[PDB]
Amino acid sequence: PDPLEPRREVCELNPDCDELADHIGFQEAYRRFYGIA
Amino acid sequence: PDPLEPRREVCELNPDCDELADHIGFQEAYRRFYGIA
Ligand SMILES: [Ca+2]
Ligand SMILES: [Ca+2]
Ligand SMILES: [Ca+2]
Numbered sequence A, B: 001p002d003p004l005e006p007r008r009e010v011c012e013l014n015p016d017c018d019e020l021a022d023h024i025g026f027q028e029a030y031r032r033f034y035g036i037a
């Protein structure tokens, strides 16, 4: 199982993160909207 | 963007495919419930 699925679902839920994910990826997009720095 | 996202969503929707996906993967699980052979 993929440990990142929970975060991937969170991002999909956020249109802005979802859309962005298609360009720079999910892990980098998640960080952009939720990471600190 | 990942071209497989549509199929991944289909599988997640199917509990049986979802569960199975965690063990042998999504592409092999999808094939198991929807592929022909
Ligand atoms: Ca999921
Ligand atoms: Ca999903
Ligand atoms: Ca998406």
Ligand SMILES: [Ca+2]
Residues within 6 Å of the ligand: A012, B005, B009
């Ligand atoms: Ca999706």
Ligand SMILES: [Ca+2]
Residues within 6 Å of the ligand: A005, B012, B018, B021
């Ligand atoms: Ca899943």
